[PDB]
Amino acid sequence: SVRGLAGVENVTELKKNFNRHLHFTLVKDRNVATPRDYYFALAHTVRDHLVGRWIRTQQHYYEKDPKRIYYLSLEFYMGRTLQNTMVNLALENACDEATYQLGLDMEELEEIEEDAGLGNGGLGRLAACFLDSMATLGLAAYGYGIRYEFGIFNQKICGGWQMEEADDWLRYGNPWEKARPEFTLPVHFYGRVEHTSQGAKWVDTQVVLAMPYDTPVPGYRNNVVNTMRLWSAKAPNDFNLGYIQAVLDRNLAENISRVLYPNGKELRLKQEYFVVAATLQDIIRRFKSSTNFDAFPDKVAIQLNDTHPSLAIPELMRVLVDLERLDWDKAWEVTVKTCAYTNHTVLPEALERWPVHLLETLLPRHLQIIYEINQRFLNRVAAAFPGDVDRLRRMSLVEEGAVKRINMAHLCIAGSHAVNGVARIHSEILKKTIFKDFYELEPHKFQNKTNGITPRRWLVLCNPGLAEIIAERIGEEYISDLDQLRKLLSYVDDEAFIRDVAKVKQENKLKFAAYLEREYKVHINPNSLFDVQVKRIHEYKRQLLNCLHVITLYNRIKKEPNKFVVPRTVMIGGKAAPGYHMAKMIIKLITAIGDVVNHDPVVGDRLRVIFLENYRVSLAEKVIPAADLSEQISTAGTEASGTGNMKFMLNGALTIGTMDGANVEMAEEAGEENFFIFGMRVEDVDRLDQRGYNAQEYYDRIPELRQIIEQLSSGFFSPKQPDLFKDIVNMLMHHDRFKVFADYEEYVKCQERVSALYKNPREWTRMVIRNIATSGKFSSDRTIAQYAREIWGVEPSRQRLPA
């Protein structure tokens, strides 16, 4: 029903276009076609329905000439496109019927599509949700990035160890993209700066070509189709031009767009400048086709997703000053009013600081511009806070020391009219700590825009069962207006609704339990509580704290085997960065625990530990609707927002978490009685750091914790390699930056409360209903409406374009 109408004319028309594409496009007959061929024929049929809208949307923007939004990101974690396109075009039921009549299962065909895995995690998925919301809200918005030939690696688990393999996502082709080789642009590297009578000139550069590929981004049932433009690196035709080697060395230039970096390398800097330089030429071209750059900020907004595209600031200055001949002060005025910066973390290991010698060689003109920006900026600090010499060194874009570095975050703050964090607590921490000096100089710049997720992909698409039972009571309006879910509060005592919510969850769990047996040959009890933590493997996300709880349960079972315990399936998934040794050790630990627990006859089906292999958007869409418990247990102050948390909330899971990131706002919206909050607050973490964190203290005073550490050390979980986990124990005991032991007791206690509530199915489900009903604020439609009004200066619209 939420999947639209299956009209007689539409079903007939889809069937014939399907057959046309199979014959003419794929060059196949029905007798030689594989499931893959059928997928492609379907993909091309659905794609056809986009193009008319795509052309008229871009035609519409040319006529109306609205302010254009440029969202610059090095990551767009798109996942699969087929189902999303059907949903947004109201084609899902029609295609389902059309394929059924051809003797095909549409769900089977959907599984053939590769994830577009052009992101690592939350940052890349946020960009993807944002594109969806911008189209749904009728904004003239463009996503700009890089078309990586290889996305995030596929994770294979071999002997409990992560193995990486190339994600060759383009092998069979991408039906969604359109190459635009006609709009290829030159990008310059290296060379030197020459000063003449008429200003500076950047000369003797190497040229790399930037070739755009456009992907359509459909809005939800409004006939708006926006563009995601991704640049591909091409060598010029006179490149290096014995002969054979010159042709083979073209690879060097084209390596720029070859691979997405996981997580100061020259290739990464090249990628960062490549996307920025090509994108800005496009922006200016489009602006000139509307001399007078005073109107530039009225027609252009550039959003810098993290500091990765921060070179947009000195690149824009370069173009305005060196090429368009504007004076410095006017160019700077235009730059600041055009650009805005989103910070994504306070963790020092993630902050970009480029060695000066790199910029010197690669982008000599940009370094000069950065120096000049810094000088003028520091003069302003000096005048506002006279004599405060330490403030000057703290605020400088140039970090002095062993190697000189440029702080890209400081560059972004200076060159932007708005700086935002991604959840209220994160945004406050920014103003109180790392950007305190900048906030004191320019308080007006600093904002919050709490993250969100798209309810199209993260409810309608992945959980149609839940979307439907909601639509039955309150209609379909909530899909583009998620605040309407509040209406579900008046159904909290409705015995029919309670039964339906719980039924949808059980079906999801049954479906996922089947998926596990079929594609991974693993057997789980679908009646157990589905306890899931899925996200990148990092020490701050504290997968290890989860591991300690799992082992505690196992040790409690072995101690009192004939005592009753609420059965659990504990699922942990996520990728470790290839060079991150500790993260790789944690994965090994998780599998090692499973090896012991899953094969202990005394445990039975009361406890299972499963490591979810190759976590990615398409896997998320399967496991999230099946979850009962969402683990969001980062040390308070470390997780800027989180977005997985919101996905679980929308899909009927209860949350055990710390007061970190968006968890704080989630608990505020639902009421803290409907959340399982535990552990230190930010203030408690601060107190512990001042006093000094001593892990040994917890080890000495908690016998259950001591036993686990002794088990890890002695080789209980690694019988043939007794010291395998020495690194983990050492880290926990002596250099734990994230205070795992400090939250252990309260975590285990809170987990007991979870189990207690699960014993009462009716009251569990009523609490679930109170969560789903208050999850409205965490729609990316809300987030994007806030960016539009408070940063970009444009009004969202829900009005249809003509079909």
- Give exposure, 672-703, as e/b (b: 16+ Cβ within 10 Å): eebbbbbbbbbebbeeeeeeebebeebbeebe
Residue 632 within binding range of ligand G27, rule CB under 6 A? no
| Of 72-80, 268-276, 362-370, 635-643: span binding ligand G27 (CB under 6 A) | 635-643
**Rounded Cα gap, residues 256 and 272, in angstroms:** 9
Coil, strand, or helix at residue 46?
Answer: helix
Question: How far is 551 from 595, CA to CA, in rounded Å?
Answer: 12
Can you say which residues are annotated as belonging to the binding site for AMP?
Answer: 29, 62, 285-290
Provide the token pair at 698: 């917890």
Is 179 among the residues that bind a second copy (CB under 8 A)? yes
Give the contacts of 230 (CB within 8 A, at least 6 positions apart).
76, 118, 144, 145, 146, 147, 177, 212, 213, 214, 215
Among 60, 66, 160, 164, which residue interacts with a second copy (rule: CB under 8 A)? 164
Q: CB of residue 675 vs a second copy: minimum separation in angstroms?
A: 38
Backbone angles phi, psi at 500, to 5 degrees: -70, -50
Residue tagged 């409004």 (tokens): 222
Contact flags string 359-398 toward a second copy, x per CB under 8 A: ----------------------------------------
The reply to whether 640 sits near ligand G27 by the rule CB under 6 A is yes
Considering only the stretches 72-80, 202-210, 282-290, 340-348, report the one whose residues sit in contact with ligand G27 under the rule CB under 6 A: 340-348
CA-wise closest residue to 547 among 734, 717, 730: 717
Q: Does 54 bind a second copy (CB under 8 A)?
A: yes
CA distances from 656 to 27, 56, 533, 628, 720 (A): 53, 47, 10, 10, 35
Q: CB–CB of 650/677 below 8 Å?
A: no
Q: Is 255 in the site for a second copy (CB under 8 A)?
A: yes
Annotated catalytic, 643? Answer: yes
Indicate if the alpha-carbon torsion angle 509, 510, 513, 515 is positive or negative: negative
Which one of 68, 221, 535, 770 is the catalytic residue?
535
Task: Draw the binding track, 530-549, toward ligand G27 (x: CB under 6 A; -: no contact).
Answer: --------x-----------
267 binds a second copy (CB under 8 A): yes
Determine if 803 is a binding residue for a second copy (CB under 8 A): no
Of residues 81, 614, 643, 765, which one binds ligand G27 by CB under 6 A?
Answer: 643
Catalytic residue among 147, 337, 344, 417: 344
Q: Is 221 a catalytic residue?
A: no
For position 166 contacting a second copy by CB under 8 A, the verdict is yes
Beta bridge mates, 478: none
Grouping H, G, I as helix, E, B as strand and the rest as coil, residue 258 is: coil
Figure out which of the listed residues 259, 278, 612, 748 binds a second copy, where binding follows CB under 8 A: 259
N-term to C-term CA, the chain? 21
Nearest distance, CB of residue 626 and ligand G27, angstroms: 22
What residues between 585 and 644 interact with a second copy by CB under 8 A? none
Q: What HEC string does 187-212 produce?
A: EEECCEEEEECCEEEEECCEEEEEEE
Pick 578 or 793: Cβ nearer a second copy: 578
Mask 106-135, x = binds ligand G27 (CB under 6 A)? ----------------xx--x---------
Q: Bridge partners of 348?
A: none
Figure out which of the listed residues 7, 29, 108, 192 binds a second copy, where binding follows CB under 8 A.
29
CA-nearest of 319, 348, 343, 345 to 331 is 319
Given the rule CB under 6 A, which of 203-211, 342-350, 407-415, 467-475 is the region that contacts ligand G27? 342-350
Q: How far apart are CA 546 and CA 590, in angstroms?
A: 10
> Can you give 211-250 as a three-state secondary structure string?
EEEEEEEECCCCCCEEEEEEEEEECCCCCCCCHHHHHHCH
Instruction: Identify residue 620 by its one-letter amino acid code.
Output: A
Of 229, 308, 647, 739, the catalytic one is 647
Q: Count residues contacting ligand G27 (CB under 6 A)? A: 18
Distance CA 48, CA 305 (A): 31
Please list every residue from 436 through 455 that binds ligand G27, using CB under 6 A: 451
Q: Which of a second copy, ligand G27, none interacts with 262 (beta carbon under 5 to 8 A by kind)?
A: a second copy
* Residue 178 touches which member of a second copy, ligand G27, none, C-beta under 5-8 Å by kind: a second copy
Look up 536 and say whether it is catalytic: yes
Active site residue 136: no
Q: CB 273 → ligand G27: shortest distance, Å? A: 21
d(CA 96, CA 16) in angstroms, rounded, equals 14
- Confirm or reject binding of residue 349 to ligand G27 (CB under 6 A): yes
- Selecting among 136, 215, 635, 643, the annotated active-site residue is 643
Among 1, 251, 263, 760, binds ligand G27 (CB under 6 A): 263
Q: Is 352 in the site for ligand G27 (CB under 6 A)?
A: no
Question: Per rule CB under 8 A, is residue 61 in the interface with a second copy?
Answer: no
Tell which residue, 486, 487, 478, 437, has the closest CA to residue 459: 478
Cβ 627 vs Cβ 532: under 8 Å: yes
Binding residues for ligand G27, rule: CB under 6 A, are 122-123, 126, 263, 344-345, 347, 349-350, 422, 451, 538, 639-643, 661
Active site residues: 344, 535-536, 541, 643, 647
Binding residues for a second copy, rule: CB under 8 A, are 23-24, 27-29, 34, 36, 48, 51-52, 54-55, 59, 150, 153-154, 163-166, 168, 171-173, 178-179, 181-182, 214, 234-235, 237-239, 241-244, 246-248, 250-251, 255, 258-259, 261-262, 265, 267, 578-579
